[PDB]
Amino acid sequence: SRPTVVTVTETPRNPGSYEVNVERDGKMVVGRARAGSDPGAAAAKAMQMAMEWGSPNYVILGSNKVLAFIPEQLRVKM
Amino acid sequence: SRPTVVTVTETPRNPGSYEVNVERDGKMVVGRARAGSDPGAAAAKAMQMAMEWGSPNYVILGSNKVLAFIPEQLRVKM
Amino acid sequence: SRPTVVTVTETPRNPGSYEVNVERDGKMVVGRARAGSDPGAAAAKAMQMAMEWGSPNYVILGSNKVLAFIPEQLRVK
Amino acid sequence: LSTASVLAFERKLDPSDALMSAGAWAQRDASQEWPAVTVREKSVLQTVDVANLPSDADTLKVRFTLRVLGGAGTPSACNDAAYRDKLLQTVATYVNEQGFAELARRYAHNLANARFLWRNRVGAEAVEVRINHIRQGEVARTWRFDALAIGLRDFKADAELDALAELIASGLSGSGHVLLEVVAFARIGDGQEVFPSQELILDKGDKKGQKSKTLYSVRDAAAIHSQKIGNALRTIDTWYPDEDGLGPIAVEPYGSVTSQGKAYRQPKQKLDFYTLLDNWVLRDEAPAVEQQHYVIANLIRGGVFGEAE
Amino acid sequence: MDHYLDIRLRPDPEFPPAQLMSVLFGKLHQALVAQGGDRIGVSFPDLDESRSRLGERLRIHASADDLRALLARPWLEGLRDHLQFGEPAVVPHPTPYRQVSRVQAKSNPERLRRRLMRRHDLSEEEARKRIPDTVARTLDLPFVTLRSQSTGQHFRLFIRHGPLQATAEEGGFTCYGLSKGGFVPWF
Structure with missing residues (x-):
């Protein structure tokens, strides 16, 4: 598991609020940090956590409402 | 039966929604938790459950629309 | 990652204040610089950081309270 | 067994975040609308956060509140x-x-000399501490202490120090409800450097270009963490x-x-x-x-x- | 001189010792410029020139009683808790030729490029090609933080204890600059 993995998941305890998890190399560096209250803030937080914490590769995972704000299959992988 | 097993399955009672199960060391840690209504949220929830639970090794199972978001066999197994 | 990326995130240690990150061509040029205490100043600083630090292909990310002060054609180059 | x-x-002795303001001396008896100082960025190829008094202000004022709960x-x-x-x-x-009389006397001593001014007490010229007892939204009792005469090492005696220790002892016992307002004026200098609480961020990345040192602020106003105030008056x-x-x-x-x-x-x-x-x-x-x-x-x-x- | 005042900093857990040495030196410089005396020597015992750290002691030299009382008050203005200074006692006289003086180094080539461009050799890009490079950047060991007063920034100060050849006693100025620029009797 070489590239830094960034995931954005929605909390089911109240809908419409997200969280982000980062893993660089075999260890978790960010655990359940508040992303936001809309898909736009979650996409912005995912791109911010991928800008830093990143080697020359990364990967972003999210739902099909959050991954619409990220440019289509261009800034999602490296 | 050493690594943590993460399974993502589609609910047949309404098509399009997914649920995740997590087992670690022969004990079912997470049973039928809601993943989402699209394959991207299912992939994000599966990678989050592989990051948090199952520290040394893990295996991620799921449908082919769900595993298309994870890089091919590089991050699925450890 | 060829288009320059400009993201505006709200700092969760005090709610209501924003911070902007700007990355151009693999390496970051602006990391966690202060914006205002309202979405108007944050959107204005995002536009200003979009003019500089990338002339072609900027991306502006942010909340729906921040991306409502700019027109819809000025969010993706 | x-x-x-x-x-x-x-937690007893529950403080709040200390808010900082600036002004001129011989105006402490009317200081209620003093402007809050703000943190700023400065390039050195790194970016730091610094704080500074205005060029017309030579006195720093720090304000917070305090409760004692008993039991x-x-x-x-x-x-x-x-x-x-x-x-x-x-x-x-x-x-x-x-x-609770020895502990209350040491707590009133730590309130008397303004030890919650961590690094901006060292280059001070004159410090004055004011303590108010808030009973029903008004002032019930006022204490005014000189902080440079009351040293840090030894625990001396004073009548008003004993009165404040009696107030804190009655609060810690469980016979009253004590709410205190603490204000401290320090005469640092005309436009000198003040030291707000430094920030710890567990999400800041590693690659170069990132900010090297950021400071704490509450709605664009330089402040101090409450846990630093607690560690200050817990010594x-x-x-x-x-x-x-x-x-x-x-x-x-x-x-x-x-x-x-x-x-x-x-x-x-x-x-x-x-x-x-x-x-x-x-x-x-x-x-x-x-x-x-x-x-x-x-x-x-x-x-x-x-x-x- | 025969009016030495040794100061031994009390160990404080909240503050590192050099961070208080900088404040002591700043108050000493500010209240030494403020007086009428011009040459007031300053020496740094407990020097420890093997691990590259300045000492925990400091002594003064002023050939008067009123001036040494003025400087006993001057370095002790307002603090009264962190110094823990001593009493002026009669000095011994080994005087092993040790002279403590300021030194200065150049580690910023961009200031040299600015001085080349905007003052004498009016050009645009000949400056960056000709002299500077990311090499031959100097260093000096004893550091003093020393925030400035008249619209300045945080700049270090480096000092040197000279040759300790015990052969004779050469007369010198007591102080050239803020604190010390000449020879002092060393113990």
Whole structure:
């Protein structure tokens, strides 16, 4: 598991609020940090956590409402 | 039966929604938790459950629309 | 990652204040610089950081309270 | 018989975030609309956050509030009633021997000399502390202290210091409701550098171009963390195994100055919080009159004290 | 001189010792410029020139009683808790030729490029090609933080204890600059 993995998941305890998890190399560096209250803030937080914490590769995972704000299959992988 | 097993399955009672199960060391840690209504949220929830639970090794199972978001066999197994 | 990326995130240690990150061509040029205490100043600083630090292909990310002060054609180059 | 698997104590001496403002001296009796100082960025190829007084202001003013809640021995959670009853009997025995008067006097001493001004007290010229007792939204009693005459090392005596210690003792006992407002004026200099609380961020990345040092702020106003104020006015502990000359340190289990790197009250010697507490509640051994002050101060601070079993 | 005042900093857990040495030196410089005396020597015992750290002691030299009382007050203005200074006692006289003086180094080539461009050799890019490079950047060991007063920034100060050849005693100025620029009797 070489590239830094960034995931954005929605909390089911109240809908419409997200969280982000980062893993660089075999260890978790960010655990359940508040992303936001809309898909736009979650996409912005995912791109911010991928800008830093990143080697020359990364990967972003999210739902099909959050991954619409990220440019289509261009800034999602490296 | 050493690594943590993460399974993502589609609910047949309404098509399009997914649920995740997590087992670690022969004990079912997470049973039928809601993943989402699209394959991207299912992939994000599966990678989050592989990051948090199952520290040394893990295996991620799921449908082919769900595993298309994870890089091919590089991050699925450890 | 060829288009320059400009993201505006709200700092969760005090709610209501924003911070902007700007990355151009693999390496970051602006990391966690202060914006205002309202979405108007944050959107204005995002536009200003979009003019500089990338002339072609900027991306502006942010909340729906921040991306409502700019027109819809000025969010993706 | 056995220490409980869960045991938690609430926080007495609950402070708030200290807010900073700037102004001119001989105006402290009307200082209620002074402008709050703000942090700024500065390039050095790194970017730092600095703070500075305005060029027309030479006096810093720090303001916060304080509460004392009482009921020190009662835990918030437990697992067996026997250990809780023995603990209540032990702390009741302590307060029936001597009320909270030594601890309250040291707390009023730490409020008198403005020790919560951490690094902006060193280059000070004159410091004045004002303390108000808020009863029904108004002022019921005012105390005004000189902080440079009241030193840091030794614990001197004063009439108003005894009055403030009586107020804090009545608050800690459980016979009144004490709300304090603390304001401190320090005469640093015309446009000098003030030191807000530095920030810790567990999400900041590693690649170059990132900010090297950011400061704390509350709605565009430079402030200090509340836990730094608590650690500032918790330094009352001086009865430890090291010789006299270093000074008093803060009340922590295995009392340790981590910035230096040393750790006094190691568990190899029998002078930490846990073993003295276990001997007090289980083997009916009071260590000394001095160690009871340390154990009760560590219970006023609070924590999570649970043995597995 | 025969009016030495040794100061031994009390160990404080909240503050590192050099962070208080900088404040002591700043107050000493500010209240030494403020007086009428011009040459007031300053020496740094407990020097420890093997691990690259400045000492915990400091002594003064002023050939008067009123001036040494003025400087006993001057370095002790407002603090009264961190110094823990001593009493002026009669000095011994080994005088092993040790002279303590300021030194200065150049580690910023961009200031040299600015001085080349905007003052004498009016150009645009000849400056960056000709002299500077990311090499030959100097260093000096004893550091003093020393925030400035008249619209300045945080700049270090480096000092040197000279040759300790015990052969004779050469007369020198007591102080050239803020604190010390000449020879002092060393113990």
